[PDB]
């Protein structure tokens, strides 16, 4: 993994994320939602669990993006949890949780759940 | 379980559900959100997995409520997945998914996730 994870990944909706997998489990980079403007770039930080594998398993990882930059402050944050699978068609399969800041009465409906698959192509 | 499940359950937000656990895995009843009017009662249907247990495990179950009745049509449905634990302080611990009907562009944000614990008191 590590090397394999480092790079640019794209999902099915048009988002892109560029990440660097550092020697001791760190993931750092940027997530960009769309248009192709600085206004859609947000910082992302996460971790990955590097393992000796002898049976083709995926590498578990996760990262967070707080939706605030110099052009937008969406009062929310998204975390993606999944695994990296390398090879010809390397992909990162994830499930995500997006939570928005709410008042306590609305807390019950503050989190959305979904999934995303990212590829290098 | 079965017998133990049959009855009225209340959650921490004020909702109440009355359910009948039928001999062959069926769960049928009503869910009521609040006020104490017919307008908050919705039909619920689900299933439970009845097991010989020799080690104190919970009974897995799940049910669905479509948010439509003669007074409201919220264009959504909620499913609760969890387990029944009986005894002095019997409870049903669940995680739920609420999906609203959306257009395809908004599908990505159509499902909320949460948890609920129901008790007999």
């Amino acid at each position: 993994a590590e090397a394999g994870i480092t790079g640019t990944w794209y999902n099915q909706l048009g988002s892109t994320f560029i990440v660097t997998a550092g020697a001791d489990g760190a993931l750092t980079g940027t997530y960009e939602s769309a248009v192709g403007n600085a206004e859609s770039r947000y910082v992302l930080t996460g971790r990955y669990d590097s393992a000796p594998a002898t049976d083709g398993s995926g590498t578990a990882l996760g990262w967070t993006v707080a939706w605030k930059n110099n052009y937008r402050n969406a009062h929310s944050a998204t975390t993606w949890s999944g695994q990296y699978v390398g090879g010809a068609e390397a992909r990162i399969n994830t499930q995500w949780l997006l939570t928005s800041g709410t008042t306590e009465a609305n807390a019950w409906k503050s989190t959305l759940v979904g999934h995303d698959t990212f590829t290098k192509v | 379980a079965e017998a133990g499940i049959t009855g009225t359950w209340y959650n921490q937000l004020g909702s109440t559900f009355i359910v009948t656990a039928g001999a062959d895995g069926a769960l049928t009843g009503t869910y009521e959100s609040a006020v104490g009017n017919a307008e908050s009662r919705y039909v619920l249907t689900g299933r439970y997995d009845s097991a010989p247990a020799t080690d104190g495990s919970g009974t897995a179950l799940g049910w669905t409520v479509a948010w439509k009745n003669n007074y409201r049509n919220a264009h959504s449905a909620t499913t609760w997945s969890g387990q029944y634990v009986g005894g002095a302080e019997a409870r049903i611990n669940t995680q739920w998914l609420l999906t609203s009907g959306t257009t395809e562009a908004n599908a990505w944000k159509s499902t909320l996730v949460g948890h609920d614990t129901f008790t007999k008191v």
Binding site: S33, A34, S40, W67, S76 | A105, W108, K109
Partner: peptide, 8 residues
């Protein structure tokens, strides 16, 4: 119009 969707 959330930053996690398209576009924006």
């Amino acid at each position: 119009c959330h930053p996690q969707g398209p576009p924006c």
